[PDB]
UniProtKB/TrEMBL annotation, chain B:
Belongs to the autotransporter-2 (AT-2) (TC 1.B.40) family. This is Membrane protein. It is found in: Cell outer membrane; Cell surface. Mg(2+) 2 binds at N71. Residues 6-33, 155-196 form the Trimeric autotransporter adhesin YadA-like stalk domain. Residues 89-115 form the Trimeric autotransporter adhesin YadA-like head domain. The chain holds residues 677 to 890 of 1090 of the full protein. Mg(2+) 1 binds at N52, D86, S87. It comes from Burkholderia pseudomallei (strain K96243).
Automatic annotation (TrEMBL), chain C:
Mg(2+) 2 binds at N70. The chain holds residues 678 to 891 of 1090 of the full protein. It comes from the Bacteria. Belongs to the autotransporter-2 (AT-2) (TC 1.B.40) family. Mg(2+) 1 binds at N51, D85, S86. It is found in: Cell outer membrane; Cell surface. Residues 5-32, 154-195 form the Trimeric autotransporter adhesin YadA-like stalk domain. This is Membrane protein. Residues 88-114 form the Trimeric autotransporter adhesin YadA-like head domain.
Amino acid sequence: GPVALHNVAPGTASTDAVNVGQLGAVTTGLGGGAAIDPKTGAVTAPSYTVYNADGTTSNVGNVGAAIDAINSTGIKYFHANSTKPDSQALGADSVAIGPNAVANNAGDVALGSGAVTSQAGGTLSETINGVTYSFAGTTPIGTVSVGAPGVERTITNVAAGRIGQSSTDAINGSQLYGTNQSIEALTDKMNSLGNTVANGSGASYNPQTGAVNG
Amino acid sequence: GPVALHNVAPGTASTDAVNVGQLGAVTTGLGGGAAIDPKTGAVTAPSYTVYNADGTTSNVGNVGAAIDAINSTGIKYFHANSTKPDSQALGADSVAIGPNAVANNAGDVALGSGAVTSQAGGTLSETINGVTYSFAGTTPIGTVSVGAPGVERTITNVAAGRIGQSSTDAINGSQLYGTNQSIEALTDKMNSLGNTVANTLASYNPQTGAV
Amino acid sequence: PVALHNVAPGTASTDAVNVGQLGAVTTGLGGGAAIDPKTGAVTAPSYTVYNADGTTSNVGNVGAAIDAINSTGIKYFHANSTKPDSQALGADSVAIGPNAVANNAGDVALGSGAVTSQAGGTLSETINGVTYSFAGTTPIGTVSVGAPGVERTITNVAAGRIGQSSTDAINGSQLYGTNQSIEALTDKMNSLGNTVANSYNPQTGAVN
Ligand SMILES: [Mg+2]
Ligand SMILES: [Mg+2]
Ligand SMILES: [Mg+2]
Ligand SMILES: [Mg+2]
Ligand SMILES: [Mg+2]
Ligand SMILES: [Mg+2]
Ligand SMILES: [Mg+2]
């Protein structure tokens, strides 16, 4: 049967033999517990822990498998559950996250499956009853898209934002609701004004049009 | 004591000796500067650069350590600073980011520590003074959650969005502020109406609108 | 020039190594790394990494793969940049994209140059002397999508629930309907003013 060769110095020339001290240094480079057994000379495979998308982990026995898992199931704290095509971060300094996500322009962020960006443009103001109200944050560096036309996403668990001239905070539904209520509250007062003014001689007020008939 | 064995051809059978040439090719496979010293035979470890979450990097000397860093401190441009449990992307094609984040449904996104999604639902319109105003983006494919009930997040540094019937842009507080101002300005105008109307007749009540 | 046969696996550090032992190391590399059973030639590993432009590349060593991961990214998570790293400085914070900084516990910074500051709550608004209370008034952190002077729009946002307890984001079509309702009411008030005047000043509301 085969016999071990003893008393072999480290090889230097390319046609020199290699000893266990040399191979062991390379197995140490793999890490993950890879090692040479001192009794049998058997080589233990490395064991690398990778993180699945369902709250579990797996161990794999070679580097390629670990890289392939990183490029499919993700890394700890950053998971996409998909087999669909890769995201594309095409714009300079853009970020694209999730299957089929596409960040097209500089500084853009695409967040979510099938989220796609278009070039951001600023909105300076709104005009209501001929009065123009100016906005904060009117020269966007780019956009964060959370979807695409017909496949938009809601954004949920958003804390109420500041309301004021300089606010660049997002606004939630409880905030628009208060505003809506105030409009109807004002309307009730207007209908009062209309009716009390009507009171006369057959005179009337029509809330449908606001017109007093007298 | 030990002597080097020379003039060894590449091994082919499992019980053949290997030479330095063969070991060096495997060593090249590690990369990161791993090598065999052509004079002493000493093996240089690989050195891999990994990215911490604090603006610094570290170097590690084996592949396992690099994978563990990737799965703890993260990768360049994608960092979570945590030791709490992993995120979970449970929905098909979902994305979950940060400790304890959970994306529960198809196409959902969970963004942030403890961010949890619930199934998305559409909102078609609002009714004000008996008139119905229809919305854009009424059929959501999923939701982006940035928190959970009682542990919500503000969203900050949001540029003003388009305001129009087809707009699916988010709005910021300066935009709602303008609208709120228009309501009070309209109210000043109405108060003037009530008062000037009273004068032609008498008193006007701003509390109820009555003349 | 000549091969040594019938070598058993080495155990002590000064023992010779055989192909079976070296083969286990190539096997640990994966990616097709191998020793040719005919010639003894070593095949490099081949690892697929994912670029930021919808392409992939193959690299021939583990260092090159780690460097790709730390530059062009991983499948489904790409930043296209050569700028400095993001920094997640707060406990349990997340920072994504070049120069992004999450400064506080539980913060998220999302995008190139996105920076957070400590979140604060907003409780209510007061309109015509009436105070309206809000939902989600005690935030545990913020998601910043930019910084002062370099804000980001947020786009393709589905319409949010409108109601007292709603913590959904609102889109522009929703504020638009509300603005329309204001001008509709104003039309009615202008009719009120004109008909009562039968001058009516629509700019001030005054009837003379
Ligand atoms: Mg896990
Ligand atoms: Mg490196
Ligand atoms: Mg960092
Ligand atoms: Mg760094
Ligand atoms: Mg907010
Ligand atoms: Mg659009
Ligand atoms: Mg990759």
